[PDB]
Write a protein that binds this ligand. Structure first.
Ligand SMILES: CCCCCCCCCCC(CCCCCCCCCC)(CO[C@H]1O[C@@H](CO)[C@H](O[C@@H]2O[C@@H](CO)[C@H](O)[C@@H](O)[C@@H]2O)[C@@H](O)[C@@H]1O)CO[C@H]1O[C@@H](CO)[C@H](O[C@@H]2O[C@@H](CO)[C@H](O)[C@@H](O)[C@@H]2O)[C@@H](O)[C@H]1O
Ligand SMILES: CCCCCCCCCCCCCCCCCCCC(=O)O[C@H](COC(=O)CCCCCCCCCCCCCC)COP(=O)(O)OCCN
Lengths: 75, 88
């Protein structure tokens, strides 16, 4: 399937080539920073997914607390 | 009438560096865009501006020592073309 690692790598390579294009430079100007961008994109995508899961868990807990607080009105 | 010359013993008969393509004259430095292609044989002297998409081909000399020389967007100067500027 489409994992966070591959989409992150594609986004990193794309943003490196996009930065190179915006400066009128060749797309594959410095290959090493293309590799660095792929790695950073993969890392950022994985961290984003890991943070999203925890964020949803925290939101669920906080909504449970809010609903519990609201339910006390009927007593 | 003289008919007499004095050869210099420090004159260089072979420059291992070759001819330098960009020749700044004092504070005038030729400006070449990163998108522009300038052939390695080209000589750019003085205030010469080469813009995006422009191209200068083999053997061309662009001496902007006297007045400014400008090459526009996607405009090309082909092989062995001498572009020079006068005071007026
Ligand atoms: C802009 C590009 C558009 C691309 C998106 C569409 C393409 C589809 C890919 C979307 C994608 C990557 C997101 C890319 C981020 C973009 C990069 C940002 C910039 C980077 C430069 C996330 O997509 C999935 O992520 C899930 C969250 O986990 C969510 O499911 C919801 O979650 C619940 C909440 O708790 C909801 O309650 C519930 O309703 C849903 O179940 C959904 O978001 C979705 O199903 C692919 O999934 C990837 O993440 C996880 C799977 O989860 C995989 O690893 C996991 O790790 C542990 C979990 O940490 C798990 O323990 C582990 O078992 C698992 O292996 C990865 O291997 C990979 O599969
Ligand atoms: C989010 C949607 C998804 C987007 C895709 C994300 C993908 C993950 C990120 C991929 C990034 C790829 C980058 C590859 C590495 C190249 C970095 C090399 C930079 C470098 O060598 O340092 C000098 C410049 O520093 C720099 O250029 C550093 C610039 C940093 C700018 C932003 C700094 C952080 C600001 C906080 C985030 C932005 C705001 C967000 C709210 C270079 O110097 P030189 O040789 O070029 O010459 C002098 C120019 N100065």
């Amino acid at each position: 399937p489409i994992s966070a690692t591959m989409v992150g790598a594609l986004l990193g390579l794309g943003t490196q080539m996009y930065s190179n294009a915006l400066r009128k430079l060749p797309y594959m100007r410095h290959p090493w920073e293309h590799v660095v961008g792929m790695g950073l994109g993969a890392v950022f995508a994985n961290q984003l997914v890991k943070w999203d899961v925890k964020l949803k868990e925290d939101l669920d807990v906080m909504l449970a607390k809010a609903r519990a607080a609201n339910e006390r009105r009927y007593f | 009438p003289k008919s007499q010359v004095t050869p210099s013993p420090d004159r260089v008969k072979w420059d291992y560096r070759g001819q330098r393509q960009i020749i700044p004259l004092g504070q005038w430095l030729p400006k070449v865009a990163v998108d522009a292609y300038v052939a390695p044989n080209v000589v750019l002297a003085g205030q010469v501006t080469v813009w995006d998409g422009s191209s200068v081909w083999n053997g061309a000399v662009l001496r902007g020592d006297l007045n400014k020389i400008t090459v526009g967007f996607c405009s090309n100067v082909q092989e062995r073309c001498v572009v020079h500027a006068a005071w007026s």
